[PDB]
């Protein structure tokens, strides 16, 4: 008897041969046949039921047999059947029939006799300490990995995902995240599966996090926030003293690092909204991340900082002790040579200081403002960066730094409300660095460089804001500012403001960017005003604004914002006081301006008729 004939006897006889020892022999036989022949002699049109026959035997073999048998026996039988099953999930010749594999997972009884429950039972954690069964477990993890990484058809993916969502399986997987389990026990496939069932299932995320408890309570110890945190930390504890130079020859260290990285990735997926990230922060997540990223490994650091970025807008960060975390993170941003880390860190900094005075104070005492100056200064002009991905990154980085700056400068600008804070000499020297000529040149060149970068619009809007706030800051010397001329365009700040303003009108019309374009326009008008007043340069601003067409035409739409209208009226009037002939050259909607003379607001009305008297009688 050859293998082909022996395998076919085995297949034909399986269901009427209940004897355990013969069943084992038959399984080896079928496996051997498959390993060797690879279905090549089987007619293509018969393949569907050839596969079904085998699948039906795999399933039957995994069922308990009433005769009591040693674990050694079952591990050997199942190892053979699971190895066949594994092969079905990667073998090219079987790939068109893979939906039959997936269909096996579909529940028929909704109980322990179902294929999915037998399978999921084989990856039970307590099997991992059994000498024979651990090998069956490892094989089932490979089967999950192969199907999840393998199947391309999206409807099939969706089906398989649904089959996996049952309490027994999520329970089983979660037991690997229990505090008492050594993290070396954690098969990476456990992450693949969690990622897979969680994907696009908002409520599954909430089931894992909250376990049906109130979103304002401390996240439950039965849920993933507490569990994933203890796994992060448990792994950190074991790698902490380990020299990273051993990595290439230290598989245990490699495995734990990878466990930490996939835990960061999984938490990233779980924390979908505000309630989740606030839960994470109340469970000391931010402290946990910052502790773990002390380990010198860049993938690990990149992944930790990515998650920090994601949770940075949490209101709970107003209650977290930041006296140690924040200086550590500033130090990291200062020395870490890779832009992704700088991007994440500065992004985090901008959100964490927002609306939180005591946090601003911590940052200032650790020289946060000085550091912003250093980060912006280290990069070339945006026009000197060739690769689009990297140019956009630098752009988002500078944008982060200036947004952080702007959250600081609020403190010190006179608010009628009565909270006029006084800057100390420490704050003063840090802030005043931002009017040094080198950074002014770089900032004005971002404003006017001529490239296709998605972040550019938001950057130019943020820069205008920075200048607005700097120039309204009492201790900032303003006398040198309009004397700074760039090497490239031979223009001063006014010329650069005017270039950004022109640029924005040539940009594509797109409801995504409309809001930001409007804010850039407003900030332009508002910055020209500030420059006029604060640098005593009313003449200079007006005559250096010949590049700008009649600002009054900005009001031709349904512009309802009262401060914008007033600004537009006032700037126009001040331009015509010094460049009288522009009144005859501009083309205005005169009846609209007359309308504004009788406006509810008295400031607007006063500006309107003052501006009206400038024009010909026509």
């Amino acid at each position: 008897m050859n293998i082909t004939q022996a395998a076919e006897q085995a297949i034909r006889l399986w269901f009427n041969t209940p004897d355990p020892m013969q069943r084992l022999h038959m399984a080896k036989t079928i496996r051997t046949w498959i390993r060797q022949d690879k279905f090549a002699q089987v007619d293509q049109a018969n393949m569907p039921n050839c596969v079904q026959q085998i699948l039906n035997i795999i399933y039957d073999g995994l069922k308990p047999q009433p005769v009591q048998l040693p674990i050694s026996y079952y591990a050997q039988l199942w190892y053979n059947l699971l190895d066949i099953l594994r092969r079905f999930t990667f073998l090219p010749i079987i790939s068109p029939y893979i939906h039959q594999v997936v269909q096996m997972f579909c529940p028929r009884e909704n109980g322990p006799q179902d294929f999915r429950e037998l399978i999921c039972n084989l990856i039970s954690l307590n099997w991992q300490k059994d000498p024979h069964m651990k090998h069956c477990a490892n094989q089932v993890f490979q089967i999950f990995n192969c199907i999840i990484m393998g199947v391309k058809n999206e409807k099939l993916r969706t089906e398989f995902a649904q089959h996996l969502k049952f309490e027994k399986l999520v329970g089983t997987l979660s037991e690997y995240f229990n505090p008492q389990v050594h993290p070396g026990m954690i098969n990476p496939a456990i992450f693949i599966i969690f990622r897979f069932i969680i994907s696009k299932d908002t409520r599954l995320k909430d089931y894992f996090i909250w376990n049906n408890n109130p979103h304002d309570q401390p996240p439950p110890p039965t849920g993933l926030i507490i569990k994933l945190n203890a796994v992060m930390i448990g792994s950190y504890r074991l790698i902490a003293g380990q020299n990273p130079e051993t990595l290439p020859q230290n598989p245990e260290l490699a495995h734990l690092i990878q466990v930490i990285i996939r835990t960061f990735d999984l938490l990233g997926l779980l924390l979908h909204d505000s309630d989740a990230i606030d839960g994470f922060v109340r469970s000391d997540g931010v402290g946990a991340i910052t502790t773990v990223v002390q380990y010198p490994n860049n993938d690990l650091i990149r992944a930790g900082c990515k998650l920090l970025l994601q949770v940075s807008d949490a209101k709970a960060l107003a209650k977290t002790p930041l006296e140690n975390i924040l200086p550590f993170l500033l130090r990291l941003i200062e020395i870490h040579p890779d832009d992704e880390v700088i991007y994440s860190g500065t992004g985090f900094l901008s959100n964490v200081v927002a609306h939180k005075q005591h946090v601003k104070d911590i940052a200032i005492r650790s020289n946060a403002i000085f550091l912003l100056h250093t980060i912006i200064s280290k990069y070339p002009r945006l026009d000197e960066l060739t690769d689009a991905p990297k140019r956009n990154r630098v752009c988002e980085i500078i944008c982060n730094c200036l947004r952080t700056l702007n959250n600081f400068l609020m403190m010190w600008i006179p608010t009628p409300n009565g909270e006029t804070k006084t800057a100390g000499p420490n704050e003063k020297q840090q802030v005043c660095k931002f009017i040094e000529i080198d950074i002014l040149k770089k900032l004005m060149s971002c404003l006017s460089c001529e490239m296709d970068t998605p972040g550019l619009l938001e950057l130019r809007s943020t820069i205008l804001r920075s200048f607005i706030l700097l120039l309204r800051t009492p201790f900032v010397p303003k006398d040198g500012v309009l004397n700074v001329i760039d090497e490239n365009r031979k223009e001063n700040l006014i010329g650069h403001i005017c270039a950004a303003y022109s640029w924005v009108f040539r940009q594509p019309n797109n409801t995504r960017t409309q809001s930001t374009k409007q804010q850039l326009v407003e900030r332009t008008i508002s910055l020209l005003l500030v420059l006029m007043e604060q640098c005593g340069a009313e003449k200079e601003v007006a005559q250096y604004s010949y590049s700008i067409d009649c600002p009054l035409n900005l009001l031709n739409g349904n512009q309802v914002k009262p401060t914008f209208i007033h600004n537009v009226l006032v700037v126009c009037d001040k331009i015509l006081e010094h460049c009288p002939t522009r009144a005859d050259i501009w083309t205005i909607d005169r009846p609209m301006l007359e309308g504004l003379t009788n406006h509810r607001n008295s400031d607007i009305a006063k500006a309107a008729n003052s501006l009206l008297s400038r024009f010909p009688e026509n």
């Binding site: 970025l309 994601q310 940075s312 959100n351 927002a354 947004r403 702007n406 959250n407 609020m410």
Partner: peptide, 8 residues
């Protein structure tokens, strides 16, 4: 008001 950016 201070400015907050959502990175999600």
């Amino acid at each position: 008001g201070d400015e907050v950016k959502v990175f999600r």
